[PDB]
């Protein structure tokens, strides 16, 4: 199996920053972020290969969120710039090896809060 763990979550003021990071136990073909709004479905929010140099992004998020991995470590960051209130939700990582494209993913982390206000 492989694990896989989050951290950095948080409440940040809308304009602000943060920094999510990813562990996960092994090497894996690909890993990703997702998001999960109240109510709402889980949504892709940035992916990335462990060898090429594939990325994908969400619309909403483009030119604001950045995906990058550290393979020494086998952590998966994703910097998330501008924040504005309608990014608030649980963030997952997830990986596997699986097809880069596939639209379900085998092993999914813990998830952790992050809220944006306007306050
Ligand atoms: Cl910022
Ligand atoms: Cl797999
Ligand atoms: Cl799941
Ligand atoms: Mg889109």
């Known amino acids: 199996q492989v694990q896989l763990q989050e951290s950095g979550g948080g409440s940040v003021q809308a304009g602000g920053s943060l920094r999510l990071s990813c562990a996960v136990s092994e090497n894996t073909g690909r890993m990703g972020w997702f998001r999960q709004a109240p109510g709402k479905e889980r949504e892709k929010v940035a992916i990335?290969?462990?060898?090429?140099?594939?990325?994908s992004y969400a619309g909403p998020v483009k030119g604001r969120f950045t995906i990058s991995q550290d393979n020494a470590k086998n952590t998966v960051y994703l910097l998330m710039n501008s924040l504005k209130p309608e990014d608030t939700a649980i963030y997952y990582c997830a990986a596997d090896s699986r097809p880069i494209y596939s639209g379900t993913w085998r092993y999914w982390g813990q998830g952790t809060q992050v809220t944006v206000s306007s306050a």
């Open positions: 990335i290969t462990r060898l090429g140099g594939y990325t």
